[PDB]
Each structure stands twice: as structure tokens, then as C-alpha cells.
mmCIF file of C-alpha atoms in Angstrom:
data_model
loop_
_atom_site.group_PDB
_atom_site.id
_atom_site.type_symbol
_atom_site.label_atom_id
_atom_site.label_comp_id
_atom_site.label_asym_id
_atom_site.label_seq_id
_atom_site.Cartn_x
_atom_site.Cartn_y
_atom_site.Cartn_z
ATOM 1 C CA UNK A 1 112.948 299.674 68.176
ATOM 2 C CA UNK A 2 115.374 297.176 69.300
ATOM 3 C CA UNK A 3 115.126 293.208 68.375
ATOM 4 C CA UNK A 4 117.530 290.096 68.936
ATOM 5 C CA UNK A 5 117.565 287.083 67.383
ATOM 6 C CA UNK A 6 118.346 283.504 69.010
ATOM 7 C CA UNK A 7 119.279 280.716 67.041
ATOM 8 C CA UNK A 8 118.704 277.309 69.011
ATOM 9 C CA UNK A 9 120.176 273.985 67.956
ATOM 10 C CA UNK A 10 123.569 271.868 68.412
ATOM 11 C CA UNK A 11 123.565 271.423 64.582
ATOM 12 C CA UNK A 12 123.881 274.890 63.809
ATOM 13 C CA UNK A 13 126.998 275.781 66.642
ATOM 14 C CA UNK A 14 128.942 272.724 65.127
ATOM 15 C CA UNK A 15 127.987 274.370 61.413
ATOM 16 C CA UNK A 16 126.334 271.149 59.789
ATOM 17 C CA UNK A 17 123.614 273.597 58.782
ATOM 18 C CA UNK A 18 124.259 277.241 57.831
ATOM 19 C CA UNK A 19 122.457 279.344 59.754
ATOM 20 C CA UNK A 20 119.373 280.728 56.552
ATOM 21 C CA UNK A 21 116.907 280.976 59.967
ATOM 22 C CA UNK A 22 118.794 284.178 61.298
ATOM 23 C CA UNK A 23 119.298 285.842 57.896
ATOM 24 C CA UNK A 24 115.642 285.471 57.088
ATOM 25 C CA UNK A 25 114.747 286.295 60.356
ATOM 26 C CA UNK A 26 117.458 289.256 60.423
ATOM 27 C CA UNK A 27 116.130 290.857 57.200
ATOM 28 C CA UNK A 28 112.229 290.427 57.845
ATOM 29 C CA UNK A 29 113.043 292.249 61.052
ATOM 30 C CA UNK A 30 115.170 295.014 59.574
ATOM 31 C CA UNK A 31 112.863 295.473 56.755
ATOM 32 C CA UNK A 32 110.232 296.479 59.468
ATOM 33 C CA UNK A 33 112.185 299.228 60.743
ATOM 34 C CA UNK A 34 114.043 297.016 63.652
ATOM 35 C CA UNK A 35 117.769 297.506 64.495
ATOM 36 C CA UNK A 36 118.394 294.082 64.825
ATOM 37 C CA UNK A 37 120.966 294.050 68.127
ATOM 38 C CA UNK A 38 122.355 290.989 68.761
ATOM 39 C CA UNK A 39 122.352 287.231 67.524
ATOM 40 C CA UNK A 40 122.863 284.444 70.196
ATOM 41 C CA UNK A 41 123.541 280.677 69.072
ATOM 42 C CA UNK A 42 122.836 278.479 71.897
ATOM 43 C CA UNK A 43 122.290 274.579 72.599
ATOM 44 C CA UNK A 44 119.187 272.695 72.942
ATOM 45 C CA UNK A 45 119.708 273.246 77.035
ATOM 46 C CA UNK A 46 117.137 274.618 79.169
ATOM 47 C CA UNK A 47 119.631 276.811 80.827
ATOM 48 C CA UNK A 48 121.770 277.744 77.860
ATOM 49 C CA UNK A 49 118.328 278.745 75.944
ATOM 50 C CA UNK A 50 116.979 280.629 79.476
ATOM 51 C CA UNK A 51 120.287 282.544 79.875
ATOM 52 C CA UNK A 52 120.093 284.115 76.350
ATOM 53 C CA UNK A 53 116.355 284.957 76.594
ATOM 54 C CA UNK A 54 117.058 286.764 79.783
ATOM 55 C CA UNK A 55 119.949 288.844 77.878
ATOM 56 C CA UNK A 56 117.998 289.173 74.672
ATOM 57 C CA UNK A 57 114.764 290.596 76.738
ATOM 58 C CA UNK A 58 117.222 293.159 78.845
ATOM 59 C CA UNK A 59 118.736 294.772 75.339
ATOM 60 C CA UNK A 60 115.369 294.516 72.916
ATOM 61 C CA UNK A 61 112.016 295.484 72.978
ATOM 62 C CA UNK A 62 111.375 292.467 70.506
ATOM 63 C CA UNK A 63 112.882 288.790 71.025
ATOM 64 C CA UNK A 64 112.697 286.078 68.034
ATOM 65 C CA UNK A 65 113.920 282.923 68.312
ATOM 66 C CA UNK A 66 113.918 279.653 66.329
ATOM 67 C CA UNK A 67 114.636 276.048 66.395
ATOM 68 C CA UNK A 68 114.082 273.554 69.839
ATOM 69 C CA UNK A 69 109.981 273.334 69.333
ATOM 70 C CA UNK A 70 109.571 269.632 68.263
ATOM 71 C CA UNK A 71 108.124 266.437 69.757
ATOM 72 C CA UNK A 72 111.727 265.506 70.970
ATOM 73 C CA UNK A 73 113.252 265.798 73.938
ATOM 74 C CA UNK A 74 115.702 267.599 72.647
ATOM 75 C CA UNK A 75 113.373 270.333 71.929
ATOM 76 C CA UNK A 76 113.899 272.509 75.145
ATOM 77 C CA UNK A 77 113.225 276.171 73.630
ATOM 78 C CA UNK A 78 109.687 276.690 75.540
ATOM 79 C CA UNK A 79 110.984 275.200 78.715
ATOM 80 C CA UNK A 80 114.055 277.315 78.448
ATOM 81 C CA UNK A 81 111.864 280.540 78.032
ATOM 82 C CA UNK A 82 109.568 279.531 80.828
ATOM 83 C CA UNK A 83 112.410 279.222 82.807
ATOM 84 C CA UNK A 84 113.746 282.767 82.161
ATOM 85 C CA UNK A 85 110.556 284.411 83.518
ATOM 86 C CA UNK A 86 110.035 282.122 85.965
ATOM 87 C CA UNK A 87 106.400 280.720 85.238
ATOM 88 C CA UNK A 88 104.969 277.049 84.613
ATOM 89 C CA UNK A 89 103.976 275.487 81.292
ATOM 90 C CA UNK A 90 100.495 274.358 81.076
ATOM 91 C CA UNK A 91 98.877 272.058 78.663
ATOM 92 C CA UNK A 92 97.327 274.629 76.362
ATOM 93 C CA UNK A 93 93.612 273.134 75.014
ATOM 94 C CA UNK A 94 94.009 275.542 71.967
ATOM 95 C CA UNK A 95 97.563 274.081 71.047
ATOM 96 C CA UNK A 96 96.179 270.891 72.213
ATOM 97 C CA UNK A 97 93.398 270.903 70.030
ATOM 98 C CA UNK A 98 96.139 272.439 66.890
ATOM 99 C CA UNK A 99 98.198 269.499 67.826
ATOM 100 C CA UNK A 100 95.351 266.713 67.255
ATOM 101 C CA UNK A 101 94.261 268.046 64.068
ATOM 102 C CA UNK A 102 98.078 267.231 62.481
ATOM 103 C CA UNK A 103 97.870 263.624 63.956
ATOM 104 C CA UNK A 104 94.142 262.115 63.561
ATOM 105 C CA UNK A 105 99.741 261.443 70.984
ATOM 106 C CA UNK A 106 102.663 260.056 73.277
ATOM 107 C CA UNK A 107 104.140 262.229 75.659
ATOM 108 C CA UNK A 108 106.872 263.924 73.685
ATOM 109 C CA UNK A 109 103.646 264.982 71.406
ATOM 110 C CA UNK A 110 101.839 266.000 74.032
ATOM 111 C CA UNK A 111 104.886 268.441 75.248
ATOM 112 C CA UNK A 112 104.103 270.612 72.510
ATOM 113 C CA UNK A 113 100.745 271.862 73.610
ATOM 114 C CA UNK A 114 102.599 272.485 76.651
ATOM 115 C CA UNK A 115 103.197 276.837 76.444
ATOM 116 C CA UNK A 116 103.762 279.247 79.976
ATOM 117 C CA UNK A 117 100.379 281.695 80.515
ATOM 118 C CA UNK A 118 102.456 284.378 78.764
ATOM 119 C CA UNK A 119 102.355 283.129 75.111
ATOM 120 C CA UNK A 120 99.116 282.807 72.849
ATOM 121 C CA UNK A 121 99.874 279.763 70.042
ATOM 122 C CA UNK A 122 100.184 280.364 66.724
ATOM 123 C CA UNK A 123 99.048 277.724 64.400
ATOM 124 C CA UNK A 124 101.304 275.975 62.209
ATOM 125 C CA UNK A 125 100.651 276.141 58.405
ATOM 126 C CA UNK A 126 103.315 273.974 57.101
ATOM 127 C CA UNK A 127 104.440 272.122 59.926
ATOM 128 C CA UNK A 128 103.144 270.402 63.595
ATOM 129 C CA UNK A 129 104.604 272.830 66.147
ATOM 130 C CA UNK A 130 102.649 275.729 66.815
ATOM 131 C CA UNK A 131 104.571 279.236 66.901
ATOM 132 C CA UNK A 132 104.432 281.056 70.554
ATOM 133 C CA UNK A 133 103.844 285.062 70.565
ATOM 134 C CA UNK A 134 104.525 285.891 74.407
ATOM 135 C CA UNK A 135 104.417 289.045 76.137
ATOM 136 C CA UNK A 136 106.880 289.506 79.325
ATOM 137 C CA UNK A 137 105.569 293.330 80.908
ATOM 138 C CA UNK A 138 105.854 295.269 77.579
ATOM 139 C CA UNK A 139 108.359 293.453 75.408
ATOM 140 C CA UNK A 140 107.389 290.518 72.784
ATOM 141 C CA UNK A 141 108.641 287.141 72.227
ATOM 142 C CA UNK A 142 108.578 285.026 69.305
ATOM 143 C CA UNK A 143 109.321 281.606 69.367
ATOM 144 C CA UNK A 144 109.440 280.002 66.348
ATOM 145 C CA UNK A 145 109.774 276.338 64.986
ATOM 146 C CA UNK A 146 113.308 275.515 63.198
ATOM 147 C CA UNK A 147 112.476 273.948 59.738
ATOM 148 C CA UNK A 148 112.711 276.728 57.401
ATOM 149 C CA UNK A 149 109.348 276.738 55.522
ATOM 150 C CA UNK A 150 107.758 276.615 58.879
ATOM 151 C CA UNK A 151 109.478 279.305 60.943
ATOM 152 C CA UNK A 152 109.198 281.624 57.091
ATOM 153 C CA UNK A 153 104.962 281.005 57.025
ATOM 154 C CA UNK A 154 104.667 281.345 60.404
ATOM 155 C CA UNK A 155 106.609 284.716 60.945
ATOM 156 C CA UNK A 156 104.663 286.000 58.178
ATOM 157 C CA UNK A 157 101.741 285.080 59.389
ATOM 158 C CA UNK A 158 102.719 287.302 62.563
ATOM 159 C CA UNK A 159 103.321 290.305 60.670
ATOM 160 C CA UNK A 160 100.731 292.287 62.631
ATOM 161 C CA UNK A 161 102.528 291.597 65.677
ATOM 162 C CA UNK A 162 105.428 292.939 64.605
ATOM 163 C CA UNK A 163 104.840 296.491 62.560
ATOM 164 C CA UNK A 164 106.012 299.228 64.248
ATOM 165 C CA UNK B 1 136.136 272.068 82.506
ATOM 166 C CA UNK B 2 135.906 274.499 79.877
ATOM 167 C CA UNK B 3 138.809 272.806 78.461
ATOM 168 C CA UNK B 4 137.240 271.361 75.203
ATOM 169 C CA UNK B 5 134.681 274.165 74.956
ATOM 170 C CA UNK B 6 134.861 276.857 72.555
ATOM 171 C CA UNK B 7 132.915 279.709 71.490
ATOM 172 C CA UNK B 8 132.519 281.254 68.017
ATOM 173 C CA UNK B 9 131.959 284.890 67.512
ATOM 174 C CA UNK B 10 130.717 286.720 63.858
ATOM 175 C CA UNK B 11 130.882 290.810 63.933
ATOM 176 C CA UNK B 12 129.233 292.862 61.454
ATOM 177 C CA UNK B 13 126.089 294.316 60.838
ATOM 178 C CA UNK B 14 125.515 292.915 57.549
ATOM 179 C CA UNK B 15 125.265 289.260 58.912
ATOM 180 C CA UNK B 16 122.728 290.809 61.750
ATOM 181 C CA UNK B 17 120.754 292.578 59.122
ATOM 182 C CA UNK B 18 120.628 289.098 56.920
ATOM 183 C CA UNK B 19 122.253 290.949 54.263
ATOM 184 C CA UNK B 20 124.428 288.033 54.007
ATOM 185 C CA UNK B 21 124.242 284.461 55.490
ATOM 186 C CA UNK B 22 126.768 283.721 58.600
ATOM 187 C CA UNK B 23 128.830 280.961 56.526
ATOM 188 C CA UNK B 24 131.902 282.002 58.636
ATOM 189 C CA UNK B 25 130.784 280.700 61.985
ATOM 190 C CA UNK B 26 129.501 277.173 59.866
ATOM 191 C CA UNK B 27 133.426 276.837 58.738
ATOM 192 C CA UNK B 28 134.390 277.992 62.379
ATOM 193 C CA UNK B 29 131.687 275.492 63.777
ATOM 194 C CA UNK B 30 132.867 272.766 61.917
ATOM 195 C CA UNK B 31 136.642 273.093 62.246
ATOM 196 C CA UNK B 32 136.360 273.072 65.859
ATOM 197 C CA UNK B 33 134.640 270.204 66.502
ATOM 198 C CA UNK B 34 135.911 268.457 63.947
ATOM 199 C CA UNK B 35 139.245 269.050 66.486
ATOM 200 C CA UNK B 36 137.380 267.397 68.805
ATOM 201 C CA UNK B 37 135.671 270.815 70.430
ATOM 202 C CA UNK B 38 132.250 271.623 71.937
ATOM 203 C CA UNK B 39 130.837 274.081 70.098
ATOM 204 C CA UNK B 40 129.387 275.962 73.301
ATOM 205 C CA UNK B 41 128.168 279.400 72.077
ATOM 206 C CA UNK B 42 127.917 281.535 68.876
ATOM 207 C CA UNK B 43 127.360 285.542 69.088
ATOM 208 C CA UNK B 44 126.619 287.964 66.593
ATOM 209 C CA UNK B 45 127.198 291.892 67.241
ATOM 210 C CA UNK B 46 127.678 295.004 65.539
ATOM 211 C CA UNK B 47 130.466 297.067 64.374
ATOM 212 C CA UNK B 48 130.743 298.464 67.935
ATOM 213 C CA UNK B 49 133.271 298.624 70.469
ATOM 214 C CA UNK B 50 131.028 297.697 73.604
ATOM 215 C CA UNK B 51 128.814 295.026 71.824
ATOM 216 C CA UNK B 52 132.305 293.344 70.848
ATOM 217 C CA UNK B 53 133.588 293.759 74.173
ATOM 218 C CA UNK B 54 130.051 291.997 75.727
ATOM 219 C CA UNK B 55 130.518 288.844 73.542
ATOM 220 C CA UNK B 56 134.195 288.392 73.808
ATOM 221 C CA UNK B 57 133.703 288.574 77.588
ATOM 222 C CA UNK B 58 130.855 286.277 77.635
ATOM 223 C CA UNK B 59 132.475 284.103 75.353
ATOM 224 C CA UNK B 60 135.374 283.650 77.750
ATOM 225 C CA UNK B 61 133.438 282.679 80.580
ATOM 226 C CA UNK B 62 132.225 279.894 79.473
ATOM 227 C CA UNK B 63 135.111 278.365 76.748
ATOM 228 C CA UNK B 64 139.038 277.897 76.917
ATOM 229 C CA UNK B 65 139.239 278.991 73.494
ATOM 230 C CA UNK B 66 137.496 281.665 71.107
ATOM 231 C CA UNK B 67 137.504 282.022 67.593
ATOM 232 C CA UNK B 68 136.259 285.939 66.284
ATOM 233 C CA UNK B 69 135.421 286.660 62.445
ATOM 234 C CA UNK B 70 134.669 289.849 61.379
ATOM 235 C CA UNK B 71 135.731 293.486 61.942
ATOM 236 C CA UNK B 72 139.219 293.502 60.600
ATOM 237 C CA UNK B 73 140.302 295.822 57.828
ATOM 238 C CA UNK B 74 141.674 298.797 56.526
ATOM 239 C CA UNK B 75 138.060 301.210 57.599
ATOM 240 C CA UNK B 76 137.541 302.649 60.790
ATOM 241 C CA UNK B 77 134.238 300.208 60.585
ATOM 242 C CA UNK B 78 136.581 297.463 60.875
ATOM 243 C CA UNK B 79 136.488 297.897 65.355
ATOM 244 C CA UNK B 80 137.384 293.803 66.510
ATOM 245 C CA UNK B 81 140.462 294.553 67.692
ATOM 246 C CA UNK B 82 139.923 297.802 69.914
ATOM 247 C CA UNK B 83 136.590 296.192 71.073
ATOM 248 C CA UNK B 84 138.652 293.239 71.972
ATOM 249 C CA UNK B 85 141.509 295.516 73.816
ATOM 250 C CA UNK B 86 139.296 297.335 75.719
ATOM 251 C CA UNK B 87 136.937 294.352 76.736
ATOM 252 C CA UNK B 88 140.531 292.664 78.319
ATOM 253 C CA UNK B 89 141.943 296.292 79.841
ATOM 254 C CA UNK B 90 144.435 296.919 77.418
ATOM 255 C CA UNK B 91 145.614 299.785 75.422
ATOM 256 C CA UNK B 92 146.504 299.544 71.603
ATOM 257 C CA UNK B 93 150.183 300.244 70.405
ATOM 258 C CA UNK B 94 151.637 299.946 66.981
ATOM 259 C CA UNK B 95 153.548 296.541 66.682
ATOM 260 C CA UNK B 96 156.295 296.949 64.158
ATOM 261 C CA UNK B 97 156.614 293.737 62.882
ATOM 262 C CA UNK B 98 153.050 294.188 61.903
ATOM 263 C CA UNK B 99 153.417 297.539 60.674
ATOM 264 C CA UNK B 100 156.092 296.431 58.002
ATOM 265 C CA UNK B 101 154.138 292.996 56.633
ATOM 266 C CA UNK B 102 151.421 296.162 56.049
ATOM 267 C CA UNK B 103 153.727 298.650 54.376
ATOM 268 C CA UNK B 104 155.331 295.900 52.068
ATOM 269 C CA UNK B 105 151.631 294.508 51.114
ATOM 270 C CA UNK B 106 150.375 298.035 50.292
ATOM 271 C CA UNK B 107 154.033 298.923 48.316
ATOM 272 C CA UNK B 108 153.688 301.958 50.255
ATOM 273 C CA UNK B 109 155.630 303.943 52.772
ATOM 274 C CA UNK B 110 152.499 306.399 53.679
ATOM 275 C CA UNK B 111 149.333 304.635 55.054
ATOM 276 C CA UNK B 112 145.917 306.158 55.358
ATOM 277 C CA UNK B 113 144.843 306.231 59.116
ATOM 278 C CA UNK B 114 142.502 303.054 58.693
ATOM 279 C CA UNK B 115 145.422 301.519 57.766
ATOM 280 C CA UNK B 116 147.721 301.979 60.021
ATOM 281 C CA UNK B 117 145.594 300.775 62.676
ATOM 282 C CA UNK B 118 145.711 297.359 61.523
ATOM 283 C CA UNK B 119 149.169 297.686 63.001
ATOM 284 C CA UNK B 120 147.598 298.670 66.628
ATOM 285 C CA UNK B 121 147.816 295.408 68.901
ATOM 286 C CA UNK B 122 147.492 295.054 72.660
ATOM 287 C CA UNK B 123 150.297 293.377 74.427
ATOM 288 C CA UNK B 124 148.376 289.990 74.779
ATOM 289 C CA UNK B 125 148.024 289.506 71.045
ATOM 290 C CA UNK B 126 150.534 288.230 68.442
ATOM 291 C CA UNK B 127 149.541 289.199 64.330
ATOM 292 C CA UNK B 128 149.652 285.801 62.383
ATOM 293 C CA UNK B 129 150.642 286.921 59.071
ATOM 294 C CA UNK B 130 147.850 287.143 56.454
ATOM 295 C CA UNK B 131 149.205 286.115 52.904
ATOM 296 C CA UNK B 132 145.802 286.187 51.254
ATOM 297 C CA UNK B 133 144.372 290.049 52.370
ATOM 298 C CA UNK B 134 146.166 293.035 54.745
ATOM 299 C CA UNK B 135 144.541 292.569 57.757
ATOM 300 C CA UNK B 136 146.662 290.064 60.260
ATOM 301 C CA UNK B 137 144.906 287.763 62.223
ATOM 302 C CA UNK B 138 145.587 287.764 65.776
ATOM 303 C CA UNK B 139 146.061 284.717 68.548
ATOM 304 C CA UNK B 140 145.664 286.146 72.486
ATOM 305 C CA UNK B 141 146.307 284.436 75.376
ATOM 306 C CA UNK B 142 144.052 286.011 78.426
ATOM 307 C CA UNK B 143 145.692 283.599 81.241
ATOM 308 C CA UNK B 144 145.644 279.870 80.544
ATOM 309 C CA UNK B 145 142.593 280.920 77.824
ATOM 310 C CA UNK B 146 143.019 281.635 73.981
ATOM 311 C CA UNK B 147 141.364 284.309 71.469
ATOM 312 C CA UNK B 148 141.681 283.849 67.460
ATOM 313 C CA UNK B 149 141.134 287.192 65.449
ATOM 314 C CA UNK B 150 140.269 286.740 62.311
ATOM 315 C CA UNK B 151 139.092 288.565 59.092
ATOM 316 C CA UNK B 152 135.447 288.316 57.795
ATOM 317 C CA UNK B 153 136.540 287.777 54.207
ATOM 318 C CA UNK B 154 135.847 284.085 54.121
ATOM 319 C CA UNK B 155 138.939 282.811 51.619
ATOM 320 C CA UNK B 156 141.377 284.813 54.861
ATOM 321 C CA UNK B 157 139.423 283.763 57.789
ATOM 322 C CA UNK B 158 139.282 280.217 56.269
ATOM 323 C CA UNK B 159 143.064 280.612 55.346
ATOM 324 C CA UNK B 160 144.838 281.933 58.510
ATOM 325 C CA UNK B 161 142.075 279.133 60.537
ATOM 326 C CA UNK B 162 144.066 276.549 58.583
ATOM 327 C CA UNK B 163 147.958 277.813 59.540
ATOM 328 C CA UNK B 164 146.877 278.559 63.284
ATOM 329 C CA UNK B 165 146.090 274.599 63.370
ATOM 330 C CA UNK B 166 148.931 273.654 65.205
ATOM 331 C CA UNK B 167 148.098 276.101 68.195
ATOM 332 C CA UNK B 168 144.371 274.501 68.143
ATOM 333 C CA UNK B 169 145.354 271.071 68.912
#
């Protein structure tokens, strides 16, 4: 099988962060038997982020991406993927529910429980934004948060997903 | 409009595979926009002529100017160039200029076939003289737009970035 890897977030294009998200994601991914395609660094922009979903999807069979999944506005990743296949986001009462638990929520909190009827969330052992495992006809998505330690304990923790 | 946008590509299989971290596009990231760029895009492909051609293509769409690590060398792994040729409709010939610098680096009147082709340039490329490692870098102009070619080993790519400045300006 075939995957691709998208890297989303201004800080990485300008290189005030190395990209360690693609190389662990690269590796995890080839270690499973995946020839790992393509890479695509985009923007935190709904139409940057939907353009290279719709390329990743049309050359892999498996999609992971990571960064643009917080409570900020800048955090355009699901919206950008939603986009792509052209369905709504819906408050999720699962993530909503995930979501409470981390705080005891504003808007931009609420946003995060917010996930298109393709994905089932993925909760977040280390961090507040649950991970998104979508299925668009028979390809997978991953969408995965960008701090490190997050998107590492929440890919393995989507291992089953992912053997081939 | 896509004046102050640029686009950063990385080829080799060994950054896709996360056999090695992508520090090349960070130093590429940073130099751009710290010359006043937008950082627009980044693309990763393999060794391989029609993946290159796909993100240099894609790259130019949507940036003035294009900066490529990756894929020069003396093995017939090393593929930037021809993917790059054949992507803009060109055909590779031998540009002598660039064919001596290799010859005197190498000490050597009698190449190996992988080297050689380091000498094979289309028309719209100059070589920018590599005084580090064999491989030139290249600068393209495809119309009013410009393409960078550089080598993956970081201390060249890093080198030839640096006397290139002037055109980046």
C-alpha cells in the first residue's frame, strides 16, 4: 500500500521548527510495510490544507496528517478536510464529552468537538485535541494533533488501524 | 501576486521514509523568509522522474521562485535535474563549462556515466559552481519565474544557497 504524509503549520514552511512530525510519522508508516509517496507542507488555510488532502487521497490508499487541531483559530486542519470531501462538521457528543473531561468551554474550545460524519475521534492521551480516523469510500485518513508527544501516543494508539 | 511567494521542494526517499529528518527545507524555510518571502508550499517526493516533475510543476503555480534540495550527484539515483527537464519540456545536453569544473574536481579525464551526467543541463538552466562537492547547483528561469537546484548534502545546499543570494533579492 500507498500512504502520504501532510505536514500543516506556517512554523514549519518558514523552518522555525524542523519538521520530527513527518520523520516519525514517515518511519512508523514504512515500518508497517507502507511506501510512503509523497510529503506535502501546507499553511494553516482551509483551502491550502483541502487542496493537499484531495491530492494525497487520489495517490494513497492511506492519508496522515498532523498539526492545525487546536482551540485556535488558526487550527483549520478538520475544516480543511471537510472541505475536500465536501461534508459538514458536526458537534461530535463523544469528542464533546473527551473535550470536557480535559477542562472541568468558549467557542474556539468548542471547535474541537466539531469532526465531519466521516471520522470516529480518537482520544487524546497526552494532550486536549482528539485524533480523527476518517474513512472517504475505501481509503483512511488520519488526522493527527501537532505537538510531538501527542501526535507519537496517539498514532500508536491507532496501530490497528493501520497494519496491513 | 505570486511575487513574494516561494515554494521549497526536498527529493529523496530517505527523508520520506524518516530515515533522516528534512533539516534542508528548515535552512531553505528560513532563508527565504528571512529575505522577506512567503513560505507558500513544501513537497517531498521520491527519487523519480514523474514525482519530481509533479512538485516542480505544482510548485510553480503557485510561487515566483523555487528552491529544490535533493537528487543531485554522481548515481543514476541522483534524477532532480532530468525530472526537472522533462517537467518544463526540455531535453538534456552536456554543458561544457560544466563538464570541465567536473573533470578538474575529479583530476580525471574519463568519467563514469553517473558522472558525466552532472554535466547534462537543459537550455533554461545555468550550473552555479559548487566549491564544496561535484554536483553544480543550478538557477532556471521558466518565463519571468525562477528554479534553484541544489544538492541534498546540507554543508553544499547551505553553501551554494549563500552565493546565489544576490539573485534572491
Amino acid at each position: 500500500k500507498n500512504a502520504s504524509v501532510i505536514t500543516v503549520g506556517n512554523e514549519i514552511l518558514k523552518g522555525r521548527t524542523v519538521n520530527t512530525n513527518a520523520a516519525f510519522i514517515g518511519n512508523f508508516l514504512t515500518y508497517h510495510g507502507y511506501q510512503v509517496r509523497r510529503g506535502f507542507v501546507v499553511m494553516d488555510d482551509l483551502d491550502e490544507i483541502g487542496w493537499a488532502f484531495r491530492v494525497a487521497l487520489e495517490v494513497s490508499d492511506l492519508v496522515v496528517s498532523s498539526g492545525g487541531l487546536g482551540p485556535t483559530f488558526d487550527d483549520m486542519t478538520v475544516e480543511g478536510f471537510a472541505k475536500c470531501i465536501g461534508q459538514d462538521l458536526r458537534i461530535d457528543e463523544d469528542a464533546l464529552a473527551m473535550i470536557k473531561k480535559k477542562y472541568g468551554l468558549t467557542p474556539q474550545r468548542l471547535k474541537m468537538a466539531k469532526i465531519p460524519p466521516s471520522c470516529r475521534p480518537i482520544e487524546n492521551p497526552v494532550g486536549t485535541a482528539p485524533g480523527l480516523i476518517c474513512a472517504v469510500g475505501g481509503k483512511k485518513v488520519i488526522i493527527l494533533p501537532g505537538v510531538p508527544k501527542e501526535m507519537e501516543a496517539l498514532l500508536k494508539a491507532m496501530e490497528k488501524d493501520i497494519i496491513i
